[PDB]
Design an enzyme around this catalytic site. Structure first.
Site, mmCIF file in Angstrom:
data_model
loop_
_atom_site.group_PDB
_atom_site.id
_atom_site.type_symbol
_atom_site.label_atom_id
_atom_site.label_comp_id
_atom_site.label_asym_id
_atom_site.label_seq_id
_atom_site.Cartn_x
_atom_site.Cartn_y
_atom_site.Cartn_z
ATOM 1 N N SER A 18 0.989 -1.711 -0.209
ATOM 2 C CA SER A 18 -0.276 -0.084 0.178
ATOM 3 C C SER A 18 1.004 1.065 0.331
ATOM 4 C CB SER A 18 -0.543 -0.314 1.065
ATOM 5 O OG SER A 18 0.041 -0.097 2.275
ATOM 6 N N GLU B 82 1.159 5.727 0.861
ATOM 7 C CA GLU B 82 0.238 6.878 1.346
ATOM 8 C C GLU B 82 0.582 7.672 0.809
ATOM 9 O OE1 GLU B 82 1.049 8.721 5.952
ATOM 10 O OE2 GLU B 82 0.081 6.757 5.913
ATOM 11 N N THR C 167 -3.475 10.788 2.904
ATOM 12 C CA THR C 167 -3.327 11.683 4.927
ATOM 13 C C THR C 167 -4.465 12.804 5.173
ATOM 14 O OG1 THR C 167 -1.478 13.355 3.943
ATOM 15 C CG2 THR C 167 -1.018 10.793 5.580
ATOM 16 N N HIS D 183 -7.751 8.938 5.319
ATOM 17 C CA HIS D 183 -7.437 9.359 6.866
ATOM 18 C C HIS D 183 -8.621 9.833 7.309
ATOM 19 C CE1 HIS D 183 -2.786 7.708 7.133
ATOM 20 N NE2 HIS D 183 -3.481 6.998 5.690
ATOM 21 N N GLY E 115 -5.546 11.287 15.770
ATOM 22 C CA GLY E 115 -4.913 13.210 15.232
ATOM 23 C C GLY E 115 -3.955 13.192 16.236
ATOM 24 N N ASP E 116 -3.379 14.070 14.949
ATOM 25 C CA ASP E 116 -1.826 14.649 16.748
ATOM 26 C C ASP E 116 -3.121 16.128 16.677
ATOM 27 O OD1 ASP E 116 -1.556 14.164 13.209
ATOM 28 O OD2 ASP E 116 -0.008 14.040 14.759
ATOM 29 N N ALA F 237 -9.168 6.965 19.067
ATOM 30 C CA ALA F 237 -9.530 6.380 17.983
ATOM 31 C C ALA F 237 -10.345 4.963 17.800
ATOM 32 C CB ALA F 237 -8.070 5.344 17.155
ATOM 33 N N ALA G 13 1.081 7.145 25.844
ATOM 34 C CA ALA G 13 1.240 6.240 26.195
ATOM 35 C C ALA G 13 1.868 6.563 27.379
ATOM 36 C CB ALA G 13 1.287 5.515 25.474
ATOM 37 N N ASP H 169 0.097 1.405 25.995
ATOM 38 C CA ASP H 169 -0.046 1.009 23.771
ATOM 39 C C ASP H 169 -0.691 0.184 23.996
ATOM 40 O OD1 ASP H 169 2.130 3.490 22.701
ATOM 41 O OD2 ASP H 169 0.118 3.472 22.757
ATOM 42 N N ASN I 28 -4.163 -0.738 24.167
ATOM 43 C CA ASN I 28 -5.288 0.422 23.438
ATOM 44 C C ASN I 28 -5.364 -0.264 21.846
ATOM 45 O OD1 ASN I 28 -4.467 3.193 21.337
ATOM 46 N ND2 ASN I 28 -6.210 2.756 22.293
ATOM 47 N N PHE J 209 11.217 13.903 11.916
ATOM 48 C CA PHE J 209 10.102 13.053 12.738
ATOM 49 C C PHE J 209 9.662 12.256 13.538
ATOM 50 C CE2 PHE J 209 8.419 14.967 8.465
ATOM 51 C CZ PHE J 209 8.662 14.647 7.708
ATOM 52 N N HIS K 269 3.135 -0.727 4.364
ATOM 53 C CA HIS K 269 2.896 0.225 4.113
ATOM 54 C C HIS K 269 4.164 0.973 3.647
ATOM 55 C CE1 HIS K 269 -0.085 3.628 4.214
ATOM 56 N NE2 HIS K 269 0.164 3.716 5.404
ATOM 57 N N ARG L 285 6.596 10.834 -3.320
ATOM 58 C CA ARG L 285 7.888 10.091 -4.330
ATOM 59 C C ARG L 285 7.435 8.846 -4.478
ATOM 60 N NH1 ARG L 285 11.712 13.808 -5.824
ATOM 61 N NH2 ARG L 285 9.966 14.116 -7.671
HETATM 62 C C1 LIG Z 1 -0.328 5.114 9.753
HETATM 63 C C2 LIG Z 1 -0.569 6.499 10.332
HETATM 64 C C3 LIG Z 1 -0.926 6.657 9.655
HETATM 65 C C4 LIG Z 1 -1.363 7.974 10.429
HETATM 66 N N1 LIG Z 1 -2.240 9.210 9.615
HETATM 67 C C5 LIG Z 1 -2.539 10.626 10.202
HETATM 68 C C6 LIG Z 1 -3.129 11.412 9.296
HETATM 69 O O1 LIG Z 1 -3.492 11.573 8.010
HETATM 70 N N2 LIG Z 1 -3.182 12.319 9.677
HETATM 71 C C7 LIG Z 1 -3.473 13.303 11.271
HETATM 72 O O2 LIG Z 1 -3.679 13.939 11.395
HETATM 73 N N3 LIG Z 1 -2.449 12.360 12.082
HETATM 74 C C8 LIG Z 1 -1.729 10.817 11.355
HETATM 75 N N4 LIG Z 1 -1.279 9.775 11.956
HETATM 76 C C9 LIG Z 1 -0.474 10.651 13.645
HETATM 77 C C10 LIG Z 1 -1.198 9.993 14.709
HETATM 78 O O3 LIG Z 1 -3.165 10.987 14.275
HETATM 79 C C11 LIG Z 1 -0.874 10.628 15.938
HETATM 80 O O4 LIG Z 1 -0.459 9.760 16.293
HETATM 81 C C12 LIG Z 1 -1.998 10.622 17.219
HETATM 82 O O5 LIG Z 1 -1.302 11.376 18.452
HETATM 83 C C13 LIG Z 1 -3.422 9.997 16.988
HETATM 84 O O6 LIG Z 1 -2.966 8.379 17.348
HETATM 85 P P1 LIG Z 1 -3.714 7.182 17.434
HETATM 86 O O7 LIG Z 1 -4.304 7.003 15.949
HETATM 87 O O8 LIG Z 1 -3.066 6.039 17.539
HETATM 88 O O9 LIG Z 1 -5.009 7.035 18.956
HETATM 89 P P2 LIG Z 1 -5.380 6.212 19.884
HETATM 90 O O10 LIG Z 1 -5.074 4.193 18.892
HETATM 91 O O11 LIG Z 1 -6.341 7.075 20.586
HETATM 92 O O12 LIG Z 1 -3.923 6.419 20.667
HETATM 93 C C14 LIG Z 1 -3.163 7.360 20.810
HETATM 94 C C15 LIG Z 1 -2.712 7.754 22.374
HETATM 95 O O13 LIG Z 1 -3.936 7.584 23.386
HETATM 96 C C16 LIG Z 1 -3.169 6.335 24.591
HETATM 97 N N5 LIG Z 1 -4.649 5.864 25.383
HETATM 98 C C17 LIG Z 1 -5.573 5.520 24.134
HETATM 99 N N6 LIG Z 1 -7.475 5.272 24.684
HETATM 100 C C18 LIG Z 1 -6.452 5.722 26.139
HETATM 101 C C19 LIG Z 1 -7.177 5.741 27.075
HETATM 102 N N7 LIG Z 1 -8.588 5.451 27.203
HETATM 103 N N8 LIG Z 1 -6.932 6.670 28.528
HETATM 104 C C20 LIG Z 1 -5.235 6.758 28.031
HETATM 105 N N9 LIG Z 1 -4.670 6.883 27.161
HETATM 106 C C21 LIG Z 1 -5.200 6.088 26.183
HETATM 107 C C22 LIG Z 1 -2.808 5.596 24.045
HETATM 108 O O14 LIG Z 1 -1.831 4.675 24.621
HETATM 109 C C23 LIG Z 1 -1.670 6.828 23.092
HETATM 110 O O15 LIG Z 1 -0.799 7.400 23.852
HETATM 111 C C24 LIG Z 1 -1.153 8.709 11.930
HETATM 112 C C25 LIG Z 1 -0.231 7.950 12.063
HETATM 113 C C26 LIG Z 1 0.011 6.233 11.521
HETATM 114 C C27 LIG Z 1 0.900 5.546 12.616
#
Ligand SMILES: Cc1cc2nc3c(=O)[nH]c(=O)nc-3n(C[C@H](O)[C@H](O)[C@H](O)COP(=O)(O)OP(=O)(O)OC[C@H]3O[C@@H](n4cnc5c(N)ncnc54)[C@H](O)[C@@H]3O)c2cc1C
Ligand SMILES: Cc1cc2nc3c(=O)[nH]c(=O)nc-3n(C[C@H](O)[C@H](O)[C@H](O)COP(=O)(O)OP(=O)(O)OC[C@H]3O[C@@H](n4cnc5c(N)ncnc54)[C@H](O)[C@@H]3O)c2cc1C
Lengths: 267, 284
Positions: free
Chosen positions: B23, B25, B56, B85, B116-117, B122, B149, B155, B158, B213, B263, B269
């Protein structure tokens, strides 16, 4: 630097290749190779073109530049006159070869040593020279060249690393004490390499033929794939005690420069 | 003995040809220049027939319009499964359901569920998407543990939570220490997670950018890697060859370990990912 490197170039036959060569010389000279060498082609430039490039390299970089000198269609008196000229003009390392046609390379090694205390490199064949009576005879011939005065042996390129390793072991068993320096051919043009290999009995592993399959019109992928192969090879050779590499640059520098980088050979 | 192993690895790789899914991205271009580059890459990479490609979406950017259009543009231009995404930043549950249902009714059936950052997690997004419809759901996995985390174990649970909610497969954050990814995969199965931990591969041509990064995602840059790129700041040519070598070696090792899914973070690129795929047997 624990690892020493040398680069092999050929006399350009066109203005375009001439430009490429000097660009490559400047790029590679920064890596401080122990020496560089320039090949000879009877019908592709002759001795004067080989000598001209050698002199140019010396004037421009100060590096030790070794001409490849063959002894076919050349008389002993001619070779002595030529050797004396080279020595008196600062050329103190010669890659002594027979060339593809009376004299064999060992005869030239002897002739050269009679003229002066030249540093002398000779050809070695991990997969046996095509014309050798047998593998035993070819190994005995290498020993003959070394015993005549050769300072080091440089191998024909190879793609089966085990072939080089087993050969090095047989050289040691035969009492050949000089370094057996692997000649490395970074491959970016597979069709050209295959032609080179087929003509020298160098085996191309099936995984390698497969690796270049379908890339005839994809130069960019060929370069990345080829650099990977070469980097893996030198890594393994390095791990097996090899501290000297001779690169068949084909007058291009990017691949050999990058490979040297991975070996810790940097400016 | 070192030589023999290499020939074996290379041969086994040559025999993988036609059994590895990949895949790619991409990210929304910000200039006319990047726009052209993106479509040139899409055209080139599409010929490799990837399992799917994704785009993304900048969290808290509101530019959700660009992402969706590109997705449709890809599906309508190549016909490939283009998965957008989706994040939990700047969006309400009712608002998210609207987007989810909007996608499903536009051909989009695969979505990468992410929180999302930060400028509702999620897992909550997957559960939400599940109820709306039966999309294929890809979530993020972190071999070296997500920054926020509290612990490695927390983590991990989760991810399981996200998988249990309906996540089809997990895609890892890029990494350079293969041993770390392998240890994590073992922990994932040992923890009862029944989906593949698809390695996200970041081919490096710009080390400075990659190191950045890595400092933002908590990804470790091995000492050997820093050493491998040392002194190449002004040598783009050498960086590309060195980077391609590292990436090809990584996937070769992973392939031997049983990984059949990759992936690639192309950064729009095609050159590097295309070549890496080539070595994996993924060709036109
Ligand atoms: C393949 C890939 C694609 C990505 N694409 C994008 C994109 O298009 N756009 C963008 O904005 N970002 C993108 N990201 C980055 C991502 O959105 C960030 O890393 C962000 O911090 C959220 O991560 P997550 O989806 O893992 O969230 P989560 O899975 O919710 O986890 C994030 C954090 O919350 C903690 N956690 C979860 N639930 C709980 C709870 N109930 N209590 C306490 N702690 C908890 C986890 O341990 C972890 O530290 C991508 C990352 C990857 C690996
Ligand atoms: C590092 C390297 C650089 C080269 N550079 C060039 C170049 O610039 N120009 C060029 O023209 N060629 C070059 N060659 C190719 C080379 O000239 C050919 O391989 C040539 O056929 C043999 O040269 P040689 O020096 O190995 O000869 P030799 O060592 O003499 O060997 C040639 C053959 O003769 C056999 N032999 C030796 N003594 C006897 C004997 N008494 N009776 C019977 N057989 C015997 C050997 O076993 C072998 O089969 C190079 C090769 C190498 C590996």
């Amino acid at each position: 630097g624990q690892i020493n490197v040398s680069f092999e170039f050929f006399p350009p036959r066109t203005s375009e290749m001439e430009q490429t060569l000097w660009n490559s010389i400047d790029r590679l000279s920064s890596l401080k190779p122990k020496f560089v060498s320039v090949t000879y082609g009877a019908n592709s430039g002759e001795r004067d073109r080989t000598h001209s490039i050698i002199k140019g390299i010396k004037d421009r970089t100060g590096l030790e530049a070794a001409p490849h000198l063959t002894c076919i269609d050349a008389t002993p008196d001619e070779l002595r006159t030529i050797a004396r000229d080279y020595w008196n003009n600062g050329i103190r390392h010669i890659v002594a070869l027979r060339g593809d046609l009376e004299m064999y390379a060992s005869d030239l090694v002897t002739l050269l040593k009679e003229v002066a205390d030249f540093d002398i490199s000779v050809a070695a064949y991990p997969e046996v020279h095509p014309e050798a009576k047998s593998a035993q005879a070819d190994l005995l011939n290498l020993k003959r060249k070394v015993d005549a005065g050769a300072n080091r042996a440089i191998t024909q390129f190879f793609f089966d690393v085990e072939s080089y390793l087993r050969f090095r072991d047989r050289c040691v068993s035969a009492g050949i004490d000089v370094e057996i320096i692997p000649g490395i051919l970074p491959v970016s043009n597979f069709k050209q390499a295959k032609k080179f290999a087929d003509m020298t009995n160098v085996r191309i592993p099936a995984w390698m033929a497969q690796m270049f399959d379908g890339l005839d019109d994809d130069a960019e992928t060929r370069k990345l794939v080829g650099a990977n192969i070469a980097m893996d090879m030198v890594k393994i050779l390095s791990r097996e005690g090899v501290k000297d590499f001779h690169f068949y640059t084909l007058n291009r520098a990017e691949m050999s420069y990058a490979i040297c980088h991975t070996l810790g050979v940097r400016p």
